[PDB]
Design an enzyme around this catalytic site. Structure first.
Site, PDB file in Angstrom:
ATOM      1  N   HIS A   1      -6.927  -5.831   0.715  1.00 31.30           N
ATOM      2  CA  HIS A   1      -5.689  -5.086   0.721  1.00 31.30           C
ATOM      3  C   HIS A   1      -4.920  -5.426   1.961  1.00 31.30           C
ATOM      4  CE1 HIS A   1      -3.414  -1.764  -0.799  1.00 31.30           C
ATOM      5  NE2 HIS A   1      -3.547  -1.021   0.286  1.00 31.30           N
TER       6      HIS A   1
ATOM      7  N   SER B   1       0.862  -1.176   0.000  1.00 28.64           N
ATOM      8  CA  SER B   1       0.000   0.000   0.000  1.00 28.64           C
ATOM      9  C   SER B   1       0.909   1.240   0.000  1.00 28.64           C
ATOM     10  CB  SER B   1      -0.897  -0.060   1.221  1.00 28.64           C
ATOM     11  OG  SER B   1      -1.952   0.895   1.186  1.00 28.64           O
TER      12      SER B   1
ATOM     13  N   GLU C   1      -8.198  -5.844  -3.890  1.00 30.02           N
ATOM     14  CA  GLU C   1      -7.604  -4.612  -3.442  1.00 30.02           C
ATOM     15  C   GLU C   1      -8.607  -3.716  -2.812  1.00 30.02           C
ATOM     16  OE1 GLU C   1      -4.666  -3.790  -3.046  1.00 30.02           O
ATOM     17  OE2 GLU C   1      -3.704  -5.450  -4.075  1.00 30.02           O
TER      18      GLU C   1
HETATM   19  N1  HLO Z   1      -5.604  10.403   7.756  1.00 27.81           N
HETATM   20  C1  HLO Z   1      -6.361  10.058   6.714  1.00 27.81           C
HETATM   21  O1  HLO Z   1      -6.318  10.663   5.653  1.00 27.81           O
HETATM   22  C2  HLO Z   1      -7.258   8.878   6.895  1.00 27.81           C
HETATM   23  C3  HLO Z   1      -7.480   8.390   8.184  1.00 27.81           C
HETATM   24  C4  HLO Z   1      -8.305   7.280   8.368  1.00 27.81           C
HETATM   25  N2  HLO Z   1      -8.868   6.683   7.305  1.00 27.81           N
HETATM   26  C5  HLO Z   1      -9.750   5.531   7.515  1.00 27.81           C
HETATM   27  O2  HLO Z   1      -9.051   4.302   7.696  1.00 27.81           O
HETATM   28  C6  HLO Z   1      -9.693   3.244   6.986  1.00 27.81           C
HETATM   29  N3  HLO Z   1      -8.599   2.562   6.328  1.00 27.81           N
HETATM   30  C7  HLO Z   1      -7.999   1.530   6.959  1.00 27.81           C
HETATM   31  C8  HLO Z   1      -6.910   0.878   6.369  1.00 27.81           C
HETATM   32  C9  HLO Z   1      -6.448   1.323   5.126  1.00 27.81           C
HETATM   33  C10 HLO Z   1      -5.289   0.700   4.430  1.00 27.81           C
HETATM   34  N4  HLO Z   1      -4.313   1.463   4.133  1.00 27.81           N
HETATM   35  O3  HLO Z   1      -3.156   1.046   3.460  1.00 27.81           O
HETATM   36  C11 HLO Z   1      -7.085   2.413   4.522  1.00 27.81           C
HETATM   37  C12 HLO Z   1      -8.171   3.031   5.141  1.00 27.81           C
HETATM   38  C13 HLO Z   1      -8.830   4.182   4.456  1.00 27.81           C
HETATM   39  N5  HLO Z   1      -9.820   3.998   3.674  1.00 27.81           N
HETATM   40  O4  HLO Z   1     -10.441   5.059   3.015  1.00 27.81           O
HETATM   41  C14 HLO Z   1      -8.666   7.145   6.049  1.00 27.81           C
HETATM   42  C15 HLO Z   1      -7.851   8.250   5.805  1.00 27.81           C
END
Ligand code: HLO
Ligand code: HLO
Lengths: 535, 533
Positions: B437, B200, B324
Site C-alpha cells: 500500500h 489510501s 494492498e
Molecule cells: N490512529 C489510529 O487509528 C491508528 C494509529 C496507528 N496505526 C498503526 O499504523 C500502522 N499503519 C501504518 C501505515 C498505514 C497506511 N495508511 O494509509 C496504516 C497503518 C495501520 N495499520 O493497521 C493504526 C491506526
C-alpha cells in the site's frame, strides 16, 4: 443334465443352476443370470429385510435375466436412448431379488477375484440386467468373475418407518448385503474368490458401495470398494429417520394409509401405486434428490455417513473413487426450468438462481445465495453458457464431486488406500447433447467394456480406453491398486492423499495426474455450506 | 526578487521558491495558509478561511505537519519513516503547497490536487513521495497538496454537536479545494480542470468529495489510488464516531459542549496518545478517527451514495497496488514482520483474519478463511501469508475499489482502473510484501526522475508513463496519450467488461475483472452474511 453343456452347470447353496455360454467379442463367457438370492420380497415381505433364498429343487434356469425390482420408469424423453438405456429391460416385479454371475468360459481354474456391481438409479430405479452392466467383457477380457444383484429400489427397498419391525428401512441395502453374502458362500462354485470381492457401483450404487463400507455387517463381505460418481455421504444418498418417517408416512397418506397398520396397508397397495407416488413425497422441488434412499437407522448406518467417514478407521480398505467430467448436467434436464436435451439449455441468471434452489433444495436463501455467489462468473454473470454450465457444476459438485472429495479425503485421512479419478471421456456414441459433457453414469459402459462390442459403434480409441479402464478396475479388484504391476511405461495412478490430493484423468489420453478434486469449490460445499446451515 | 516566485492570491502575497527538478526549475509555493489555524477553540471545528495577510508571505518552505501519531514500530527504517511527518507536528498545519512550472505556465494549466493518505490519522503534504516538482516540471501540471487535520483533530466527531461536527479534516480539504478554485489562476492553474488525486485515506477523501455535494464544484476529475469512500475503514457511522470520541474523551479525563471543551484543553499528544485505544476490535486497516457519515458532509453511507448517486459528468481513475494488504500485516497480525518472510501457520491465519476483518462474526471469518485458503495447499505458510496479505488488501482496498469502480461506472461515471504491479527497486520492505500500500505514489509523483534516488532507468521511464497517465487523465479525463497510437489503450472500466490495466514496467496489459470472484465474496456475500448470521 446329460445332453447340455458341462461347463454351465454349477451348484450353489440354494441348489443347482444352469447358466448360459454368452458370446463376448474375445470369445465365450459363462453367465448365470437371474439366480435367486432371496425369497421374493413379495406380499407380506414387502419392505421387509430379504430372507435368504430357500433352496430349490432340480436345475434352476439361470440363462436369462430376472425381473427388475418394481420401479418408476423414466418417461421424460420416451424413445430416447439416453434415458431408455437406464429403463428396466425386464419385467417389473417385486420378485426381483435375483443376481447375475459372469465368469470366463470355461470357469477360471484358480479362484478369481470377484467384482460385484451395484447399480445406481437414485435408489428408485436400476437393474443389474441393463445392457451397460453386462459383465461379459470384464469376465471375458479380464477373466474377472462379475456379480450383479438386483436389489429393491424405491419404496420397496427403502421405504422406512424407522424403528418399526415391518419397515425398518434400508432393505435395499440388505438385499445388496444378502447378495454379498451369497457371493461369499457361493461364488467359489464359479471360480470366484470370496476372499477377493470388490464392490463397484455408480450413482446410488456407489452410495450403496459406500454404505457397505460403512456398515459393519457388510464389511466382512468384500475387501475393496469402488465408488463411481456416488458416495454414501452427501445430500442425496441418505435421509434422517425423521425424514424417512415423514416420507414413508406421506407416501402412505398419498395411497390412503401405529406403524404396523400403516405398513400393513402399504403392503396391500399395488406396487405401481407406490411407485406412482414415491416421487410426490420429496420435501422440495429437487433434482438429484430421491424419495426413498438409505435411512440413517442407527442400525445399517450406525450414524450419518458424514459421521461414519469423519470418525471410523479404514485400514484394510482400498477404494477407487471418482467422478465424471459433468456429474450435474444429466439432472438438469429433469426439473430445472431452462434445461433440455434438445437445445443448448442456455439459461438466464433468473433460471440459474431458480435452478440453484432446485439443485440445492435443502438450502436456505443465504446458502442458495452463497451457491449462486460462488458459481457466478462475476465477469459474465448474465452469460447463459456460463450459467448453464455453472448450474451443471452446482448440481454435480454438490451431489457428487464434493461428496466424493469429502469421501476420498476422510477415507485417506483415516488410512484407507484411495485412488481417485475424474472420467473425462464423452462416449462418441452419446446421445445427450454436447453441452451435458460427460454426464452422470456415462463412464459405466466403458468400465464394463461395452466399447469392446464391435456392434456398438464405439471408436477404436474407445475400445483401447475401455480395456484400459477395465484393466484399472480389475487391477484394483485384484490388488487394491488400479496400476499395472508390470507395465510402467504408462504413468502411475497415485493414491489420493490429503497431502497431495492426486487423482487421474480418465480420457483417451494416457493418465494425467491432477491435484485437488475441485479443492476450492469443494471447500465451499464440504466446509462452508454446512456451517451456513448452523445459522 | 524573482517575480516568477511572487504570487498575489486573494489573501495577499506569496514568495515561492524556485526548486530544481531534474529537467529544469519549478516554482514551489509551499506553506500557504488556507485556513485559520485550527488551534484552541478552533480545534475540532470546521476550518475557517485564512484571514488576509500583510506584505509577502514567505512560501518557500513546507509548513508544519498536522498533529498526528508518529509511527514508531520500526524506528529509523526508511520504509516507515518515509510516511512519518518530515516537519514539526502542530495543530497549526492548514497549509497547502502549489508547485508550478517555471516559468508560471502561460495558459491555464490542469491542476492536480493531492490528498495524502495516512488512515485519516497521519500523513502530510510535505513528504518526499508527494513532491509535486516532477509533475510540475515534466508534465507542466500545477500540483497542489494541502495538509488536512488528521486523527482526533481532523475527525473526532460528536455528530450533531456544534463544536465537533466531524469531517473537519475533509472540510480542511474542501477549503484547500475552494482555495484552489479561488487562487490557482494566480499560479497559472486552471480552476476549471481540477483533478483530485490521493491514496489510501487520500483516496477515500477524494472519493468523499465525489460523494459530497459542496465539494463537487471544486474539481472535475478524481483519482483514487488504493482507497475509497466506500468500504470498511474510510468511514464510521455517527454512533461509532460519538462512541470513539466519548471514549477518547474518557481516556484523557473528560453533553457534547462540556466534553469537547475538555478535549480542547488537552495537549495534542494526549489526544494522539489515546487515539488508538478507541478501536472496538484489535484491528488492522481500521482507524479511529475517520470521516463520519454525519448526514452532512456525507449525507448517507458512501455505499448508499455510490449505489444511488448520478456520476455521469465525472471521470475517475481508480486502482490498487499488487499487495494492498501486506503493509498492514506487520502492525498487529502476529507472525508478520518485515524482518522475516512472515510465513504463518494456519492458526495465525484464522487469527490474522479476525484482526483483518475485525468486524467479522466467526461465520464470516470462517467464510473468509475458507475462501482464502488454497485447499490444494491448506497449511502452506507462503500461501497463508499471501492470503492474509490478500484478505486485508481485498477487504480494504481492492474490493472496495471494485465496488466503487463498478458503481461509478454503472451510474455513468467514466472510470479507468489499474492495478499497479511494479515493486520499486528501492523498496525497503521485504519481498513477501510485494507492492505494498502506498508504493505507487513515488512513481506517480515522478520520483524516479530524480536520478539521486537510485531508481532503475526502466523505473525512470515507468514513472514518466504514470505521470503521463495521471496528468493526461488530469488534462482530458482520459489517461491515454491523446497523440500516441503505439498503445495498447487503457479502456474505461465498465460494469460489463470490467477492464483495467496493470501499471508495471511492461506496456499496459488490459485485464478484466478486478478480483471479480473474490470481490463478489466481499461485496456481495459478506454483506448478506453479516446482514443475517
Ligand atoms: N490512529 C489510529 O487509528 C491508528 C494509529 C496507528 N496505526 C498503526 O499504523 C500502522 N499503519 C501504518 C501505515 C498505514 C497506511 N495508511 O494509509 C496504516 C497503518 C495501520 N495499520 O493497521 C493504526 C491506526
Ligand atoms: N422416485 C424418486 O424419488 C424419483 C424418481 C424420478 N426422478 C427423476 O428422474 C430423473 N432422473 C433420471 C436419472 C437419474 C440418475 N440417477 O442415478 C436421476 C434422475 C433424477 N433427478 O432428480 C427423481 C426422483
Amino acid at each position: 443334465e446329460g445332453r447340455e453343456d458341462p461347463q454351465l452347470l454349477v451348484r450353489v447353496r440354494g441348489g443347482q443352476l444352469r447358466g448360459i455360454r454368452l458370446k463376448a467379442p474375445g470369445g465365450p463367457v459363462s453367465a448365470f443370470l437371474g439366480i435367486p438370492f432371496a425369497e421374493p420380497p413379495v406380499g407380506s415381505r414387502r419392505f421387509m429385510p430379504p430372507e435368504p433364498k430357500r433352496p430349490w429343487s432340480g436345475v434352476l434356469d439361470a440363462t436369462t435375466f430376472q425381473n427388475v425390482c418394481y420401479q418408476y420408469v423414466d418417461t421424460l424423453y420416451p424413445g430416447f436412448e439416453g434415458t431408455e438405456m437406464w429403463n428396466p429391460n425386464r419385467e417389473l416385479s417385486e420378485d426381483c431379488l435375483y443376481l447375475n454371475v459372469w465368469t470366463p468360459y470355461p470357469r477360471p481354474a484358480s479362484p478369481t477375484p470377484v467384482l460385484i456391481w451395484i447399480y445406481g438409479g437414485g435408489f428408485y430405479s436400476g437393474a443389474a440386467s441393463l445392457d451397460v452392466y453386462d459383465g461379459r467383457f470384464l469376465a471375458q477380457v479380464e477373466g474377472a468373475v462379475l456379480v450383479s444383484m438386483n436389489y429393491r429400489v424405491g419404496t420397496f427397498g427403502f421405504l422406512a418407518l424407522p424403528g418399526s419391525r415391518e419397515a425398518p428401512g434400508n432393505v435395499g441395502l440388505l438385499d445388496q448385503r444378502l447378495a454379498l453374502q451369497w457371493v461369499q458362500e457361493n461364488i467359489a462354485a464359479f471360480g470366484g474368490d470370496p476372499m477377493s470381492v470388490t464392490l463397484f457401483g455408480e450413482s446410488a450404487g456407489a452410495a450403496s458401495v459406500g454404505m457397505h463400507i460403512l456398515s459393519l455387517p457388510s464389511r466382512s463381505l468384500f475387501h475393496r470398494a469402488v465408488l463411481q460418481s456416488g458416495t454414501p455421504n452427501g445430500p442425496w444418498a441418505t435421509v434422517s429417520a425423521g425424514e424417512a418417517r415423514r416420507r414413508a408416512t406421506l407416501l402412505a397418506r398419498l395411497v390412503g394409509c401405529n406403524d404396523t397398520e400403516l405398513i400393513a396397508c402399504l403392503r396391500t397397495r399395488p406396487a405401481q401405486d407406490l411407485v406412482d407416488h414415491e416421487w410426490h413425497v420429496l420435501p422440495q422441488e429437487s433434482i438429484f434428490r430421491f424419495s426413498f434412499v438409505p435411512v440413517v437407522d442407527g442400525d445399517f448406518l450406525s450414524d450419518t455417513p458424514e459421521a461414519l467417514i469423519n470418525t471410523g478407521d479404514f485400514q484394510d480398505l482400498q477404494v477407487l473413487v471418482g467422478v465424471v467430467k459433468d456429474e450435474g448436467s444429466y439432472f438438469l434436464v429433469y426439473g430445472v426450468p431452462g434445461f433440455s436435451k434438445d437445445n443448448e439449455s442456455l439459461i438466464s441468471r433468473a433460471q440459474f438462481l431458480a435452478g440453484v434452489r432446485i439443485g440445492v433444495p435443502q438450502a436456505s436463501d443465504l446458502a442458495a445465495e452463497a451457491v449462486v455467489l460462488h458459481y457466478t462468473d462475476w465477469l459474465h454473470p448474465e452469460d447463459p453458457t456460463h450459467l448453464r454450465d455453472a448450474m451443471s457444476a452446482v448440481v454435480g459438485d454438490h451431489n457428487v464431486v464434493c461428496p466424493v472429495a469429502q469421501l476420498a479425503g476422510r477415507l485417506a485421512a483415516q488410512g484407507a488406500r484411495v485412488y481417485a479419478y475424474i472420467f473425462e471421456h464423452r462416449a462418441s456414441t452419446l446421445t445427450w447433447p454436447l453441452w451435458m459433457g460427460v454426464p452422470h453414469g456415462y463412464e459405466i459402459e466403458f468400465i464394463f467394456g461395452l466399447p469392446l462390442d464391435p456392434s456398438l459403434n464405439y471408436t477404436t480409441e474407445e475400445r483401447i480406453f475401455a480395456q484400459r479402464l477395465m484393466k484399472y478396475w480389475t487391477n484394483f479388484a485384484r490388488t487394491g491398486d488400479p496400476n499395472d504391476p508390470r507395465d510402467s511405461k504408462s504413468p502411475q495412478w497415485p493414491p489420493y492423499t490429503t497431502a497431495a490430493q492426486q487423482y487421474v484423468s480418465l480420457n483417451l489420453k494416457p493418465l494425467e495426474v491432477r491435484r485437488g478434486l475441485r479443492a476450492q469449490t469443494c471447500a465451499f460445499w464440504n466446509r462452508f455450506l454446512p456451517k451456513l446451515l448452523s445459522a
